Design a binder for this molecule. Structure first.
Ligand SMILES: CC(C)C[C@H](N)C(=O)O
Lengths: 273, 100
């Protein structure tokens, strides 16, 4: 299947309180593998997965020095954007970036991207051609014209097609993905008068992607069902539940279905008093 | 820019059993700006040793983080997570419900 190498970058100004806080986080297949945090006396790029200590001290010095350079460029960028938007020097602001390459099963580049946001809104994005830019407002247009006139898209296309895929191709290459199957159970809770709540739980699963449904007579109860957003247990696994309110005494007419990539086939379960 | 209001869930790592040590989570998502203050409370009083995960953000730019603390639930103790963030006029408190 496909693989991804992506970096998520945050720069937050804190006028009067010190230097901006800068973070870079690297993900292989949506799993954190390296992190740089500026909030230290001697900030270093650090491994975050069990396989990254293989890299020598040469790797860590180069990446640390790269991240420190990026940090200082985003410090400048934060100041630049105050000019572009005519904002005062007293407020905190945030720049974010997502940058990366996704390759198919065949090792060919599927998608490369470089997307910037300012204070929670899209700012500029490199287009799929890896040759042109989409600007979100008239401020970002200024950056666009600067980058068109500096061969930035050229420098990016060479990174995304070249070094990104090369590093990705070798990173965790170990190519296949962990799955932990959900364990499921149903709980029973009282409601006012002649109704009860049935809650179908899925616990201990990985990855987060999952679907829970409740069926009455073969049909999924989309309208009446309450769902929580999937949430981490804190140990690497995830949790989710779905509930329905049903008539007292009709609990055995309802079936929970759990769908997860780890399961040989979906779980079906009912309230078991 | 924008402000996004944090979404909060308070829940245990393991199914709760009275008297058995466990971990209480406060999972806070979908917020912007990234500055946030998260407290966990037992019977109304701040819990001292609350650990914070590293902060991350999603494809929609919004931030998320997990706060957690050791706890030993009992039948009558009350737990809550309180979050202060510029998107909200007052701090939001969400109580732990052992059934959710
Ligand atoms: C926010 C950054 C993309 C700004 C860019 N370096 C500029 O000076 O236009």
């Amino acid at each position: 299947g496909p693989h991804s190498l992506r970096y998520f970058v945050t720069a937050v100004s804190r006028p009067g309180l010190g230097e901006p806080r800068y973070m870079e986080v690297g993900y292989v297949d949506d799993t954190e593998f390296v992190r740089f945090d500026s909030d230290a006396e001697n900030p270093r790029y650090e491994p975050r997965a069990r396989w990254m200590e293989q890299e020598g001290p040469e790797y860590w010095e180069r990446e640390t020095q790269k991240a420190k350079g990026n940090e200082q460029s985003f410090r400048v960028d934060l100041r630049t954007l105050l000019g572009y938007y005519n904002q005062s020097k007293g407020g905190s602001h945030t720049i974010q970036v997502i940058s990366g390459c996704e390759v198919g099963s065949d090792g060919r580049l599927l998608r490369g991207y470089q997307q910037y946001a300012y204070d929670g809104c899209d700012y500029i994005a490199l287009n799929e051609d890896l040759k042109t830019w989409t600007a979100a407002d008239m401020a970002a247009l200024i950056t666009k014209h600067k980058w068109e006139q500096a061969g930035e898209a050229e420098r990016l296309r060479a990174y995304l097609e070249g070094t990104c895929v090369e590093w990705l191709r070798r990173y965790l290459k170990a190519t296949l993905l962990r799955t932990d199957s959900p364990k499921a159970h149903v709980t029973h809770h009282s409601r006012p008068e002649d109704k009860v709540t049935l809650r179908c739980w899925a616990l201990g699963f990985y990855p987060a992607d999952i679907t829970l449904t409740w069926q009455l007579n073969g049909e999924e109860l989309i309208q009446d069902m309450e769902l929580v957003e999937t949430r981490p247990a804190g140990d690497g696994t995830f949790q989710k539940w779905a509930s329905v309110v049903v008539p007292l005494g009709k609990e055995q007419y309802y079936t929970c279905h759990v769908y997860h990539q780890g399961l040989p086939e979906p779980l079906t379960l009912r309230w078991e008093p | 820019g924008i402000q996004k209001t944090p979404q909060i869930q308070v829940y245990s790592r393991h199914p709760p059993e009275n008297g058995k040590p466990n971990i209480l989570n406060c999972y806070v998502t979908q917020f912007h700006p990234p500055h946030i203050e998260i407290q966990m409370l037992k019977n109304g009083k701040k819990i001292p040793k609350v650990e914070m995960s590293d902060m991350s953000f999603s494809k929609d730019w919004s931030f998320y983080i997990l706060a957690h603390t050791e706890f030993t639930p009992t039948e009558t103790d009350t737990y809550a997570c309180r979050v202060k963030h510029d998107s909200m006029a007052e701090p939001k408190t969400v109580y732990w419900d052992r059934d959710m």
